Short mmCIF file of C-alpha atoms in Angstrom, two decimals:
data_model
loop_
_atom_site.label_atom_id
_atom_site.label_comp_id
_atom_site.label_asym_id
_atom_site.label_seq_id
_atom_site.Cartn_x
_atom_site.Cartn_y
_atom_site.Cartn_z
CA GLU W 1 21.68 112.96 20.11
CA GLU W 2 21.09 115.02 23.17
CA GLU W 3 24.00 118.27 24.03
CA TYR W 4 25.58 118.23 27.22
CA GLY W 5 26.52 120.87 29.72
CA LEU W 6 30.02 121.97 29.35
CA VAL W 7 33.45 120.80 31.18
CA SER W 8 36.59 121.41 31.36
CA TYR W 9 39.77 120.77 29.18
CA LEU W 10 41.35 119.19 32.28
CA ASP W 11 38.28 116.59 32.25
CA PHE W 12 39.64 115.53 29.24
CA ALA W 13 43.42 115.60 30.11
CA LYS W 14 42.47 113.55 32.60
CA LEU W 15 42.34 110.50 30.04
CA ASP W 16 44.99 108.56 28.83
CA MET W 17 44.00 108.13 25.23
CA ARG W 18 46.11 106.22 22.55
CA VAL W 19 46.36 104.37 20.01
CA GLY W 20 46.93 100.75 19.71
CA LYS W 21 46.52 97.27 17.17
CA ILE W 22 44.49 94.54 17.98
CA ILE W 23 46.52 91.70 18.18
CA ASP W 24 43.80 89.12 18.93
CA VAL W 25 40.46 87.95 19.49
CA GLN W 26 38.50 85.69 21.03
CA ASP W 27 34.88 84.83 21.94
CA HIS W 28 34.15 85.49 25.98
CA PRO W 29 33.62 82.00 27.01
CA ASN W 30 30.68 83.71 29.57
CA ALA W 31 29.44 85.85 27.27
CA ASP W 32 28.18 85.51 23.99
CA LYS W 33 27.92 89.29 23.15
CA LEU W 34 31.17 89.91 23.89
CA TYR W 35 34.68 89.50 23.16
CA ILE W 36 38.02 89.15 24.68
CA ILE W 37 40.62 91.73 22.63
CA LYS W 38 44.63 91.88 23.39
CA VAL W 39 45.74 95.13 21.72
CA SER W 40 49.49 96.27 21.42
CA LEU W 41 50.81 99.65 22.43
CA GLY W 42 54.39 98.75 21.35
CA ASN W 43 56.29 97.34 24.35
CA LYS W 44 53.32 96.93 26.19
CA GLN W 45 49.95 95.27 26.29
CA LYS W 46 46.29 95.27 27.29
CA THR W 47 43.20 92.81 27.35
CA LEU W 48 39.81 94.28 27.15
CA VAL W 49 36.19 93.22 27.07
CA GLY W 50 34.70 94.77 24.39
CA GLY W 51 31.19 94.03 23.27
CA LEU W 52 32.10 93.76 19.87
CA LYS W 53 30.71 90.46 18.34
CA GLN W 54 27.67 91.55 17.22
CA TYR W 55 29.37 93.55 14.64
CA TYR W 56 32.78 92.26 13.71
CA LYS W 57 34.06 89.48 12.55
CA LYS W 58 37.11 87.97 14.72
CA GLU W 59 38.96 88.56 11.35
CA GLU W 60 37.27 91.82 10.96
CA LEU W 61 39.48 93.08 14.24
CA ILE W 62 43.07 91.49 13.38
CA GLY W 63 45.12 93.80 13.28
CA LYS W 64 43.18 96.38 13.54
CA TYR W 65 44.40 100.31 14.87
CA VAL W 66 41.94 101.38 17.53
CA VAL W 67 41.95 103.86 19.70
CA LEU W 68 42.28 102.80 23.85
CA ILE W 69 41.88 104.18 27.49
CA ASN W 70 44.73 103.39 28.63
CA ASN W 71 44.58 104.52 32.53
CA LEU W 72 41.09 102.55 33.15
CA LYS W 73 40.85 100.72 36.39
CA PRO W 74 40.36 96.84 35.60
CA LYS W 75 36.64 95.50 36.13
CA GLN W 76 35.79 91.87 36.32
CA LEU W 77 33.13 90.48 33.59
CA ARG W 78 31.96 87.54 34.01
CA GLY W 79 35.30 85.76 35.10
CA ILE W 80 37.91 88.00 32.74
CA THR W 81 39.89 91.16 33.52
CA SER W 82 39.05 93.69 31.56
CA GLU W 83 42.14 96.51 31.38
CA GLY W 84 40.52 99.23 29.09
CA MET W 85 38.16 99.97 26.93
CA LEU W 86 37.83 100.56 22.89
CA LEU W 87 36.23 103.40 21.49
CA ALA W 88 33.57 103.35 18.85
CA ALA W 89 31.05 105.49 17.76
CA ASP W 90 27.38 104.31 17.86
CA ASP W 91 24.11 105.21 15.81
CA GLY W 92 21.98 102.21 16.21
CA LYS W 93 22.14 101.69 13.16
CA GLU W 94 26.24 100.53 13.07
CA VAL W 95 29.27 100.87 15.50
CA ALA W 96 32.40 102.20 13.62
CA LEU W 97 35.52 101.70 15.84
CA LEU W 98 37.89 105.09 15.78
CA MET W 99 41.07 105.24 14.68
CA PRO W 100 44.03 106.98 13.57
CA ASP W 101 43.62 108.43 9.69
CA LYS W 102 46.88 106.85 9.09
CA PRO W 103 49.37 104.17 10.66
CA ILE W 104 51.10 105.86 13.47
CA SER W 105 53.44 104.06 15.78
CA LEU W 106 51.26 102.39 17.97
CA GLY W 107 51.04 103.39 22.24
CA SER W 108 50.70 106.92 20.49
CA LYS W 109 48.83 109.81 22.54
CA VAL W 110 45.55 111.23 21.30
CA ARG W 111 45.42 115.00 22.41
CA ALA N 1 34.82 108.75 46.62
CA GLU N 2 38.56 106.80 47.42
CA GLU N 3 41.28 108.84 45.58
CA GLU N 4 42.01 106.49 42.34
CA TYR N 5 45.40 108.88 41.60
CA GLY N 6 46.18 108.22 38.00
CA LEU N 7 43.59 106.04 37.08
CA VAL N 8 39.98 106.82 35.70
CA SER N 9 36.68 104.82 35.86
CA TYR N 10 34.12 104.88 32.69
CA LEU N 11 32.10 107.67 34.44
CA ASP N 12 35.87 109.88 33.69
CA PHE N 13 35.16 109.20 29.84
CA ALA N 14 30.98 109.44 30.19
CA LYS N 15 31.56 113.04 31.19
CA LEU N 16 32.73 114.04 27.88
CA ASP N 17 29.97 114.35 25.13
CA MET N 18 32.58 113.04 22.11
CA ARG N 19 31.29 113.28 18.62
CA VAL N 20 31.55 112.00 15.24
CA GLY N 21 31.57 115.28 12.88
CA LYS N 22 32.30 115.84 9.29
CA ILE N 23 34.78 119.21 8.44
CA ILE N 24 32.54 121.39 6.47
CA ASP N 25 34.51 123.90 6.13
CA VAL N 26 38.21 125.32 6.66
CA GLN N 27 40.06 128.85 6.68
CA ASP N 28 43.23 130.17 7.51
CA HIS N 29 43.55 132.09 11.28
CA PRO N 30 43.67 135.86 10.79
CA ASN N 31 45.63 135.95 13.41
CA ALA N 32 47.97 133.35 13.04
CA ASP N 33 49.69 131.75 10.60
CA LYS N 34 49.74 128.38 12.00
CA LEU N 35 46.37 127.80 13.22
CA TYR N 36 42.91 126.97 11.16
CA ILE N 37 39.57 127.95 11.78
CA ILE N 38 37.19 124.47 11.25
CA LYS N 39 33.45 123.88 10.60
CA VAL N 40 32.50 120.70 11.89
CA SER N 41 28.90 119.52 11.03
CA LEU N 42 27.10 116.93 13.59
CA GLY N 43 24.09 117.03 11.67
CA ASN N 44 21.54 119.70 12.44
CA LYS N 45 23.84 122.13 14.69
CA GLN N 46 27.32 123.03 13.11
CA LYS N 47 30.60 123.89 15.79
CA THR N 48 33.75 126.67 15.18
CA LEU N 49 36.64 125.05 15.94
CA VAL N 50 40.68 126.16 15.92
CA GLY N 51 42.89 123.95 15.61
CA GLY N 52 46.52 123.58 14.80
CA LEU N 53 46.53 121.04 12.06
CA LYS N 54 47.84 123.70 9.39
CA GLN N 55 51.63 122.62 9.45
CA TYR N 56 50.15 118.44 9.15
CA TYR N 57 46.99 119.13 6.69
CA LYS N 58 46.11 120.70 3.34
CA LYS N 59 42.81 122.25 3.71
CA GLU N 60 40.85 120.64 0.88
CA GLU N 61 42.18 116.87 2.09
CA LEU N 62 40.28 118.00 5.19
CA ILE N 63 37.29 118.84 3.49
CA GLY N 64 34.66 116.34 3.35
CA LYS N 65 36.71 113.47 6.41
CA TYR N 66 34.93 112.65 9.27
CA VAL N 67 36.68 113.51 12.60
CA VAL N 68 35.74 112.99 16.02
CA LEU N 69 35.11 116.36 17.98
CA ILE N 70 34.89 116.70 21.60
CA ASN N 71 31.26 118.54 21.89
CA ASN N 72 30.90 120.12 25.61
CA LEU N 73 34.44 121.81 26.62
CA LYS N 74 34.05 124.98 27.33
CA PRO N 75 34.72 127.75 24.30
CA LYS N 76 38.11 128.91 23.97
CA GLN N 77 39.12 132.76 22.77
CA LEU N 78 42.92 131.87 20.52
CA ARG N 79 43.43 135.07 19.34
CA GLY N 80 40.10 136.58 18.54
CA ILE N 81 38.56 133.83 17.18
CA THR N 82 36.66 131.60 19.20
CA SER N 83 37.16 127.58 19.82
CA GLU N 84 34.20 125.79 20.67
CA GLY N 85 35.24 122.02 20.70
CA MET N 86 38.25 120.33 20.18
CA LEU N 87 39.63 117.76 17.60
CA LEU N 88 41.36 114.49 18.45
CA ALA N 89 44.32 113.23 16.46
CA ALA N 90 47.07 110.97 17.38
CA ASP N 91 50.42 112.70 17.90
CA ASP N 92 53.86 110.62 18.09
CA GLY N 93 56.11 113.77 17.67
CA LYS N 94 56.62 112.75 13.78
CA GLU N 95 53.65 112.62 12.71
CA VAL N 96 49.66 113.62 13.35
CA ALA N 97 46.91 111.45 12.31
CA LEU N 98 43.48 112.57 12.70
CA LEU N 99 41.23 109.94 14.37
CA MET N 100 38.31 109.01 12.44
CA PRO N 101 35.40 106.41 12.62
CA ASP N 102 36.29 103.65 10.21
CA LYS N 103 33.11 103.88 8.51
CA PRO N 104 31.10 106.93 7.33
CA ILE N 105 28.42 106.51 10.25
CA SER N 106 26.09 109.43 10.78
CA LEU N 107 26.68 112.59 11.89
CA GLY N 108 26.70 113.27 15.20
CA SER N 109 26.95 109.44 16.44
CA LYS N 110 28.11 109.17 20.21
CA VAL N 111 31.17 107.54 20.74
CA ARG N 112 30.99 104.92 23.84
#
C-alpha cells in the first residue's frame, strides 16, 4: 500500500477509539452487503452499519470484541442510522476486524 | 467546514494510515528503563518504534505478534531514539491489551 504524508499525533488524538463487544447482528433490511450491528461499551450501546456480511456470518460476530470510533457523527444508510464504525484490516483477500489481544473491560480507550 | 466540536467525520479517520504489522525485534531502550525499541515489519518496509510496553509484555511474547501501527505520524525523539510510529493498545487503567487483527492478514494491510 502507498505511503502517506505525515500528520500530527493531535490528528490521531481527535478520534475516540474504544473497545466494544458485539451484542447482536442483523441483516440491513434494505442493503444486501450490510449488517446492523449493536455494540456494547459497557453501560452504553451503539448501533452501527457495517459492510461485513460478505466476510462474516452473523453468528461469527456475536460476542466478538471489536474496536469502534465512538465520536463519529451519525449517518443515514438506506433508512438506518449508523452511530459509528468498526475498524478492520483488508488486503483484498480477507477482512480482519481489529480486537484487543485479551478480554479487557468494555469501553476501554485505545491509545 | 462548520465546527463539529467533539465529533469527527470519516475524513478525520482517513487522514491516519493505520496498518497491520508484525513485531520482528524488541530491545531495551538504552536510556529509558520502562521502554522498548520495537522493529515492526510491514512486509517490504520496516519501522522503528519506541513503546512503553516493558511493564506489560515480555520481549519474547512480542516477537511475531501481529499489531496495529499508525504509519504516518510525524517522528518523535524519545531520550535519544527516534520513534517512527505507534502501536495501538487498549488500556482500562488495570490492564494493557495491544490491538491485533483477528486473523494473521498480510503485512502492511490497511485498516478501513
